[PDB]
Amino acid sequence: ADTPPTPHLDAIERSLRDTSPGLEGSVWQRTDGNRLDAPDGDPAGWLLQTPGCWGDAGCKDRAGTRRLLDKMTRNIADARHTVDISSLAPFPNGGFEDAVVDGLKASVAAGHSPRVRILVGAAPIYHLNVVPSRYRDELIGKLGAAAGKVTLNVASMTTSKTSLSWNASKLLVVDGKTAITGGINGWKDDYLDTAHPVSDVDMALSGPAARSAGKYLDTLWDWTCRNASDPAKVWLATSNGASCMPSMEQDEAGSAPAEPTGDVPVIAVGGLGVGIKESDPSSGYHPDLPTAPDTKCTVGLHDNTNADRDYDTVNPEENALRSLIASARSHVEISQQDLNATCPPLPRYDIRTYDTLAGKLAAGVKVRIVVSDPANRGAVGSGGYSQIKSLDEISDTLRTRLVALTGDNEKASRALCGNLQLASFRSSDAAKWADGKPYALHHKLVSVDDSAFYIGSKNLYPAWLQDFGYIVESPAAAQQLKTELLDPEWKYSQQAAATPAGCP
Numbered sequence: 001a002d003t004p005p006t007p008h009l010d011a012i013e014r015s016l017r018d019t020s021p022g023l024e025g026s027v028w029q030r031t032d033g034n035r036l037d038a039p040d041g042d043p044a045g046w047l048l049q050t051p052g053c054w055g056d057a058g059c060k061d062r063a064g065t066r067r068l069l070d071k072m073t074r075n076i077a078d079a080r081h082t083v084d085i086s087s088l089a090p091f092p093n094g095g096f097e098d099a100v101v102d103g104l105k106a107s108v109a110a111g112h113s114p115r116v117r118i119l120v121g122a123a124p125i126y127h128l129n130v131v132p133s134r135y136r137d138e139l140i141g142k143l144g145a146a147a148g149k150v151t152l153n154v155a156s157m158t159t160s161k162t163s164l165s166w167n168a169s170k171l172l173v174v175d176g177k178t179a180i181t182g183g184i185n186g187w188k189d190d191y192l193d194t195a196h197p198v199s200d201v202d203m204a205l206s207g208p209a210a211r212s213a214g215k216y217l218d219t220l221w222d223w224t225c226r227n228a229s230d231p232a233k234v235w236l237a238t239s240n241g242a243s244c245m246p247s248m249e250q251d252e253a254g255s256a257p258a259e260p261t262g263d264v265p266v267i268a269v270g271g272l273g274v275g276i277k278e279s280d281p282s283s284g285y286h287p288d289l290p291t292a293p294d295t296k297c298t299v300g301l302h303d304n305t306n307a308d309r310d311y312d313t314v315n316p317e318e319n320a321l322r323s324l325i326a327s328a329r330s331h332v333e334i335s336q337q338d339l340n341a342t343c344p345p346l347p348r349y350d351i352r353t354y355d356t357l358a359g360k361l362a363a364g365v366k367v368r369i370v371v372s373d374p375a376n377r378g379a380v381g382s383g384g385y386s387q388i389k390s391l392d393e394i395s396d397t398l399r400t401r402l403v404a405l406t407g408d409n410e411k412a413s414r415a416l417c418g419n420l421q422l423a424s425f426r427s428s429d430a431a432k433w434a435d436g437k438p439y440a441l442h443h444k445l446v447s448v449d450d451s452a453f454y455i456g457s458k459n460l461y462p463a464w465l466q467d468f469g470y471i472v473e474s475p476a477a478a479q480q481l482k483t484e485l486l487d488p489e490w491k492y493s494q495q496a497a498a499t500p501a502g503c504p
């Protein structure tokens with residue numbers, strides 16, 4: 001009870017408990033006594049950005065990549081009992097795969113027999129080559145004589161075909177004690193073996209919040225083990241005759257409390273997407289849902305982001321992001337692939353998130369939004385690393401939401417023009433990577449007041465997936481985030497700032 005207050009964490013916790021009280025302890029959880037997992041002589045080494053090659057359009061010194069991969073390997077090498085991987089399909093390949101294999105063999109060479117889960121979400125059409133039994137067989141071959149001691153459960157899953165829901169959480173949890181999470185998929189060709197690497201960020205922690213994340217994953221595997229009765233939803237491959245492990249993380253927690261490793265207070269928050277759980281039946285959540293039609297796109301699907309109270313209650317991650325932004329009293333940095341979705345089949349944007357940002361702009365709070373360059377766009381379903389044709393799609397929508405709010409277009413411009421910084425992502429002085437390709441950005445990052453930040457898998461654009469991430473409140477940690485990532489991103493991305501329509 002010497003601890004500093006957590007104004008931002010307190011406001012997010014309120015929201016989550018109003019929206020989803022019944023999911024506390026499974027799909028969301030606040031904890032004290034976490035540690036941001038950094039090695040010696042590398043104090044911001046808990047922040048796992050890739051490629052981490054600022055100021056060089058040839059990206060020759062990929063210090064972020066190196067650290068990301070050394071930390072995956074080493075977390076796995078330290079396993080006594082359990083390894084729990086979630087990702088977006090394909091299953092991890094190249095160096096992401098080697099981290100897991102080198103890590104498991106090390107654990108076996110230390111004398112352990114680890115249980116391993118690997119879970120991917122699969123979109124109903126690109127799958128993919130995506131095959132659990134082939135992937136498991138590949139790991140078994142790569143694992144050598146170690147395979148005998150490693151218990152694998154390998155699954156690919158789609159929770160709803162019609163509502164476009166599957167796992168996209170990106171988690172590596174070891175012994176319910178350490179967790180690495182964020183936006184990074186195990187896709188070597190996009191992240192590693194390319195001269196135009198995707199820019200992304202994970203974070204690494206240890207502590208009670210690592211257990212919060214395993215609890216989330218047992219939630220996913222309960223559904224997944226049960227729904228292997230339906231091969232249209234789940235493909236599953238186990239090794240060594242082993243049963244499905246719905247309960248791996250509870251089994252490893254057993255009956256003792258998670259011990260603190262540090263002093264960082266953390267909120268873990270995910271969502272159940274569509275087709276796992278209908279609602280939190282214990283929730284009293286009764287919002288006034290938004291109403292503003294979009295002039296560009298009228299979504300055909302039932303709109304779960306903007307017009308479905310039950311979905312909110314099983315997807316606390318949406319409101320956790322909105323209330324993180326709403327808690328900003330001085331400034332917010334948004335670093336995202338996208339704020340707008342591909343409409344149809346999804347709503348183009350989250351009305352409330354956009355309302356939340358327009359409120360901030362009106363109130364004189366500084367809003368910074370950096371997104372992946374529009375030049376990255378496909379290909380309606382590719383899905384390339386942009387879902388807009390120009391940054392005006394974000395500022396025009398801000399304008400539209402500023403007009404709803406205030407009544408006049410001239411007040412709108414003072415708040416938009418005065419308080420918004422909007423740009424495509426760059427990491428050096430050059431407009432694109434040295435090989436000609438544009439920089440692809442895939443962060444799911446929010447920072448508020450250099451005090452509290454989200455790093456996880458949940459995008460700010462509309463998506464109805466199983467996602468997960470962490471919210472940290474710590475001035476020290478957010479100072480490291482500012483210095484190592486956000487300042488540098490603004491340094492180089494300000495070159496590609498948008499002046500909105502209606503501004504000088």
Ligand SMILES: CCCCCCC(=O)OC[C@H](COP(=O)(O)O)OC(=O)CCCCCC
Pocket residue numbers: 088123124125126164168169183185342344345346380381382383457459462463464
């Ligand atoms: C025609 C566009 C409809 C896309 C379906 C729903 C979605 O939000 O997917 C976004 C998701 C987020 O991934 P990450 O966690 O940020 O890496 O991307 C995917 O799940 C794969 C896209 C496959 C297209 C589905 C037809």
